[PDB]
Amino acid sequence: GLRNVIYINETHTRHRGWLARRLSYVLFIQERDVHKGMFATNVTENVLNSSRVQEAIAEVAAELNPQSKAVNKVKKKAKRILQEMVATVSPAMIRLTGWVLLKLFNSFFWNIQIHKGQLEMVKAATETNLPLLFLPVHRSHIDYLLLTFILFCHNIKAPYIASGNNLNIPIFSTLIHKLGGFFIRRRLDETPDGRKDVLYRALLHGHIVELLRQQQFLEIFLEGTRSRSGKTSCARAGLLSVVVDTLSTNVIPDILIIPVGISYDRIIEGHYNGEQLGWSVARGVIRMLRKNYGCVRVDFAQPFSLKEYLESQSQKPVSALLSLEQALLPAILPTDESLRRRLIANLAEHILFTASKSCAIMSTHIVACLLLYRHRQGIDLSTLVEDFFVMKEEVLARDFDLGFSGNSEDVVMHAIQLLGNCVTITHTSRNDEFFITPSTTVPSVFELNFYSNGVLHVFIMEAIIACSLYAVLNLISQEQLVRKAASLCYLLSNEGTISLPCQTFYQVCHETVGKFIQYGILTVADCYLKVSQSKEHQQFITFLQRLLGPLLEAYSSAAIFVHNFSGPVPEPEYLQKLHKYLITRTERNVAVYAESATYCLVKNAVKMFKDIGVFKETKQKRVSVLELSSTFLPQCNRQKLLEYILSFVVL
Ligand SMILES: CC(C)(COP(=O)(O)OP(=O)(O)OC[C@H]1O[C@@H](n2cnc3c(N)ncnc32)[C@H](O)[C@@H]1OP(=O)(O)O)[C@@H](O)C(=O)NCCC(=O)NCCS
Ligand SMILES: CCCCCCCCCCCCCCCC(=O)OC[C@@H](O)COP(=O)(O)O
């Protein structure tokens, strides 16, 4: 029950015949319904006529005086900001781009899958007179080309995209402006001379207020950048404040929010090893686009009402105040605007979770997951083909989408040829069957790990309970397992979203222990559970244990570096000589999983220690210098902090 948006023969057009086939596409572009009338107009004028904006202008001028006829200057400046900000969509441009993208996608992709039922909802959300808001998860640059192209090819008007100021350059800007992309500043700060450019912020508020008030569609990537790790990073609540404020003020009745999940079998950009490790370009871009990449699946979550969601928050009698340190450390070592911050901050996480949990699991995702953790030593095809069937069922049985179908053999054989850089395909003695080992080198592994992290979010919970199960043992008391698991969540907090922000970890772990008894891995003898001593269950427990190896090893070997920490140092200088150590631990062959040396997990560990408050952040001259906290001034605390993390990791 799917749809391939790129698959366009004459059957997708009205006119038919030899000629009508030969020019199939050009007709399909002609038949699309996009006119100038259904786009917001008089935007600059309406934003410059705003009573908030003119008052914001009125006071910024007032400061500059010894009558006050300098208003001309600030007003003339205020205009120029909107002149570089606002977008101006041209149906002519959109069609002609859509045509090109329909050629190019059909060149360097195999297909782009859409579940009709998910879009038939969006076409019901469209035909109610409300402004929609599309919140995808940033992974590759192609994300912002797809989201629009998918809608354009179902007779839906292109959304106005919130774009980084980087792209604002001559020619390339005036193209983007005509394709809906409106440019916004980074940090919204002219200079540290001024506190806040009240004018710019008021104009930015006004623009979005106006663009929503005219019932147009908005596209915001809540992840400031695309993910280097290959999993959803920390959500930014920058613009969601601007969009919620619009509702808070009562200038528009309601907004619909649509989480989107775009999964790639192979991202055009490829591995991020170049960053994670720490003429000739244009040649590289030719070398880039001449390669083929795999399948794509874009998954739209159910549109929900922000108005109702914001009411639903006011039904909660008490909010979550517990600190990451106050959760963990006491178990290891014997308001007015702050509520408003948390309120909008949680929404962003709730969205990214919903989006990330829509993303379809790919073939590469499943192959990498097996190759890294299930085997590593490397296996002959037949065993991997039989496993690829077994894993596929494990994913479907947990209610997740697959971005592949057909013969397991062929779906794996396709997926190998994408991982051809990491994977080595050889011939074994007295066999017609071919052998498959992955790379365990410094640079190659990161590519396998990156694509492997695609599946991590399906098993992330069961893995925490699987690690905690091993932890508690060194006839389990259920309370202790939940209590122990609950911290391993607070510890791996920064690494990624584990569950919905609206419920506590205790409950999530209780439910996931509740799942293990339903599967029948744990059974009843306060409650006393026993682990099923069955080959299949044990190998699954050890797979789930192994799966979190890199994510614990890095956090362990991070604390091994803290053991000897000399004086206060700037963080950007520290992170490099912490990241050096983890590379040096592969270089010497001390670190087990070479995955751990990735730059992403280093930032997570330091932010985790900064959340725990081992390093007291005392930022100066616009950089974070790390002060070794009074609690962790002695050695015996850091010793226990090291001993603790070691309990979860298998030796
Ligand atoms: C413009 C943008 C950069 C703003 O984020 P930022 O400036 O980096 O983040 P800050 O926390 O410094 O934002 C400052 C303001 O945001 C608002 N804000 C940020 N987090 C907030 C939260 N949790 N609750 C309420 N308001 C919040 C406040 O009004 C805050 O005011 P302040 O300056 O007095 O603190 C925005 O782009 C963003 O972060 N999110 C969208 C990402 C994006 O579209 N990037 C382009 C690539 S497609
Ligand atoms: C049918 C035709 C479809 C029309 C397609 C038009 C698409 C318009 C694109 C608008 C401009 C892009 C949107 C903003 C995205 C953006 O700003 O990406 C850059 C950052 O996130 C990532 O930065 P980094 O990872 O640090 O390089």
UniProtKB/Swiss-Prot annotation:
What keywords were assigned to this record?
Acetylation, Acyltransferase, Lipid biosynthesis, Lipid metabolism, Membrane, Mitochondrion, Mitochondrion outer membrane, Phospholipid biosynthesis, Phospholipid metabolism, Phosphoprotein, Transferase
Q: Where is this region: Important for mitochondrial localization?
A: 1-34
Q: Name one GO cellular component term.
A: mitochondrion
What is its EC class?
transferase
What effect on the protein does mutating R14E have, as reported in its record?
Abrogates mitochondrial localization
Q: Where is this motif: HXXXXD motif?
A: 138-143
Instruction: Please give the residue ranges for the topological domain Cytoplasmic.
Output: 33-651
Main location per the UniProt record: mitochondrion
User: In this chain, where does the modification Phosphoserine occur?
Assistant: S280
Entry superkingdom: Eukaryota
Tell me one GO molecular function of this protein. glycerol-3-phosphate O-acyltransferase activity
For this protein, what reaction is catalysed?
A: sn-glycerol 3-phosphate + an acyl-CoA = a 1-acyl-sn-glycero-3-phosphate + CoA; (9Z,12Z)-octadecadienoyl-CoA + sn-glycerol 3-phosphate = 1-(9Z,12Z)-octadecadienoyl-sn-glycero-3-phosphate + CoA; sn-glycerol 3-phosphate + (9Z)-octadecenoyl-CoA = 1-(9Z-octadecenoyl)-sn-glycero-3-phosphate + CoA; sn-glycerol 3-phosphate + octadecanoyl-CoA = 1-octadecanoyl-sn-glycero-3-phosphate + CoA
State the function annotated in the UniProt record.
Answer: Mitochondrial membrane protein that catalyzes the essential first step of biosynthesis of glycerolipids such as triglycerides, phosphatidic acids and lysophosphatidic acids. Esterifies acyl-group from acyl-coenzyme A (acyl-CoA) to the sn-1 position of glycerol-3-phosphate, to produce lysophosphatidic acid. Has a narrow hydrophobic binding cleft that selects for a linear acyl chain. Catalytic activity is higher for substrates with a 16-carbon acyl chain.
Q: What is known of its domains?
A: The HXXXXD motif is essential for acyltransferase activity and contributes to the binding of the cysteamine moiety of the acyl-CoA and the phosphate moiety of the glycerol-3-phosphate.
PANTHER family according to UniProt: GLYCEROL-3-PHOSPHATE ACYLTRANSFERASE, GLYCEROL-3-PHOSPHATE ACYLTRANSFERASE 1, MITOCHONDRIAL
Q: What is this protein called?
A: Glycerol-3-phosphate acyltransferase 1, mitochondrial
